[PDB]
From Swiss-Prot, chains A, B:
It is found in: Cytoplasm; Endomembrane system; Golgi apparatus membrane; Lysosome membrane. Acts as an E3 ubiquitin-protein ligase. Plays an essential role in autophagy activation during viral infection. Mechanistically, activates TANK-binding kinase 1/TBK1 by facilitating its dimerization and ability to phosphorylate the selective autophagy receptor SQSTM1. In order to achieve this function, TRIM23 mediates 'Lys-27'-linked auto-ubiquitination of its ADP-ribosylation factor (ARF) domain to induce its GTPase activity and its recruitment to autophagosomes. (Microbial infection) Mediates TRAF6 auto-ubiquitination in the presence of human cytomegalovirus protein UL144, resulting in the virally controlled activation of NF-kappa-B stimulation at early times of HCMV infection. A zinc finger (RING-type) spans 4-49. The chain holds residues 28 to 104 of 574 of the full protein. Homodimer. Interacts with PSCD1. Interacts with UBE2D2. Interacts with TBK1 (via N-terminal kinase domain) and p62/SQSTM1. Changing H26A: Loss of E3 ubiquitin-protein ligase activity. Changing C7A: Loss of E3 ubiquitin-protein ligase activity. This is E3 ubiquitin-protein ligase TRIM23. In the C-terminal section; belongs to the small GTPase superfamily. Arf family. The RING-type zinc finger domain is responsible for E3 ubiquitin ligase activity. This domain is catalytically active as a dimer.
Amino acid sequence: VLECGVCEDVFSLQGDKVPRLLLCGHTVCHDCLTRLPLHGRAIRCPFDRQVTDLGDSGVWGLKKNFALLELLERLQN
Amino acid sequence: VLECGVCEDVFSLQGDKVPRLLLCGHTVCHDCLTRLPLHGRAIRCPFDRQVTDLGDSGVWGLKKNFALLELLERLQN
Ligand SMILES: [Zn+2]
Ligand SMILES: [Zn+2]
Ligand SMILES: [Zn+2]
Ligand SMILES: [Zn+2]
């Protein structure tokens, strides 16, 4: 298991705690991303302040961290 | 351990096998990324052919998969 650096809860394989990617390369859980400040469809990485621009799907358009999800599944299974 | 989906070698915590991110959310090891075919200043994801635009630093400008590296380091120790 691995924890989200913002909420310190463990990532889930899908749903409200799924790991999503910012353009700086950091992962944050979906829920924390919906709770971060938004300014004109732009979100700042909480760790390095770098900007990721959001599209029409918002946080749901941020890509899942596929390799992390594969590792978490392999560790679980 | 987790393998790069292209070369099937295991990721390293630094160096030529470090996991780097494409904008589609997939991770590929640094070395495979330097060996993949180029389409202009852009690289196509080897899994889904989606395009990631490269800057003047090429593959070195692709972000490391920080969360994956954190988990892999925890697994090593
Ligand atoms: Zn979180
Ligand atoms: Zn960041
Ligand atoms: Zn590789
Ligand atoms: Zn891809």
